[PDB]
Amino acid sequence: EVDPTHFEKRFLKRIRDLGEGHFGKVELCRYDPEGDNTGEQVAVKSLKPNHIADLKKEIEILRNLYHENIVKYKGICTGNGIKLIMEFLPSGSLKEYLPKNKNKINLKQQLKYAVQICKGMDYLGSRQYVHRDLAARNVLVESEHQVKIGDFGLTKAIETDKEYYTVKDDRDSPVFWYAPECLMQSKFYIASDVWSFGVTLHELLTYCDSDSSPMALFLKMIGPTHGQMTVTRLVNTLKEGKRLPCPPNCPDEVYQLMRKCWEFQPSNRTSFQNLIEGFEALL
Ligand SMILES: Cc1n[nH]c2[nH]c(=O)cc([C@H]3CC[C@H](CC#N)CC3)c12
Numbered sequence: 001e002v003d004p005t006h007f008e009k010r011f012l013k014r015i016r017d018l019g020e021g022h023f024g025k026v027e028l029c030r031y032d033p034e035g036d037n038t039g040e041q042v043a044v045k046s047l048k049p050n051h052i053a054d055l056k057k058e059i060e061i062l063r064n065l066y067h068e069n070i071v072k073y074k075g076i077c078t079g080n081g082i083k084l085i086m087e088f089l090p091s092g093s094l095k096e097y098l099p100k101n102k103n104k105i106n107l108k109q110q111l112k113y114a115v116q117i118c119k120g121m122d123y124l125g126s127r128q129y130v131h132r133d134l135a136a137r138n139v140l141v142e143s144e145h146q147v148k149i150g151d152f153g154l155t156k157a158i159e160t161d162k163e164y165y166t167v168k169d170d171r172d173s174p175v176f177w178y179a180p181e182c183l184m185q186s187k188f189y190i191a192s193d194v195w196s197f198g199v200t201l202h203e204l205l206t207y208c209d210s211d212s213s214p215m216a217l218f219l220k221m222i223g224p225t226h227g228q229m230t231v232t233r234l235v236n237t238l239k240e241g242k243r244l245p246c247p248p249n250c251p252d253e254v255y256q257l258m259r260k261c262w263e264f265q266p267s268n269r270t271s272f273q274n275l276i277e278g279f280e281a282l283l
Contacts (some may be wrong), residue, residue, distance in 0.1 A: 005075035007031055007085045010184055012077060021153040022172045023051045028088060033054035042074055045084040059084050059149050069120035071140060071150040091141040098207040104144055111279045113147045114201055119196060120149045122272035128158050130165050132188055134196035135177050164189045175231050176214040181266060183235050191266030199260025205247040228229045253282060
């Protein structure tokens with residue numbers, strides 16, 4: 001019998017590199033058994049040359065997630081060493097899509113994408129998981145009307161009888177998408193992911209312009225060349241009460257909901273289900 005989720009490594013042939021996430025690297029590949037370039041194009045995540053247990057945990061997370069605004073698990077490709085086979089969204093991430101499609105995508109469509117991310121993140125949060133990496137580069141574009149969350153490499157399960165995941169390894173962390181308690185105390189909540197959405201929402205409203213990215217804007221405020229002290233400087237700036245400014249051609253009613261995602265203490269911060277009600281009211 002043939003398992004459809006069991007992808008043989010020999011048939012799987014590469015096309016291009018799509019992205020790389022700390023240790024795992026994601027490559028576009030054509031799975032073509034018959035050998036005439038008629039095969040299905042699939043996204044193929046695998047380890048950069050261990051973090052096999054981390055990838056195996058990521059695989060088992062994604063396999064059991066079923067949601068419209070979350071990327072589809074297609075299968076696995078297994079000597080040891082394992083590869084995660086996902087569906088291929090050709091339009092790509094918001095980082096690549098939004099700059100190239102400013103004419104098609106308007107504020108009304110941007111808020112629809114924003115709701116769809118929250119619906120994916122609320123589904124994720126309700127299943128006792130914490131994402132730890134919500135940024136525009138990880139938000140994929142299925143079509144002009146649909147977006148999906150297309151990476152779960154830093155996704156971890158919230159522990160037993162506790163409201164946060166105690167972070168151990170944090171070498172390459174997106175510090176400019178991270179809330180103060182993640183930077184300071186190194187313990188990641190669901191309310192932390194709301195902060196990360198707030199920055200993703202800013203990225204979305206700015207059409208993922210590199211000149212006005214979160215990294216670029218924070219570096220303009222705190223200082224461009226401080227290196228090792230950058231993160232402690234970044235906290236001290238957020239302690240004073242200095243947030244990312246309102247994007248150009250962004251309403252205050254949108255920006256105020258974005259500001260509610262960046263309240264200092266997580267206990268008095270807005271949630272995803274609350275944000276859906278906020279955006280839909282404007283729609
Ligand atoms: C899955 C995935 N399926 N289809 C796609 N098309 C893309 O252009 C990019 C991707 C992904 C490539 C890997 C990055 C990881 C990061 N940071 C997320 C985005 C995918």
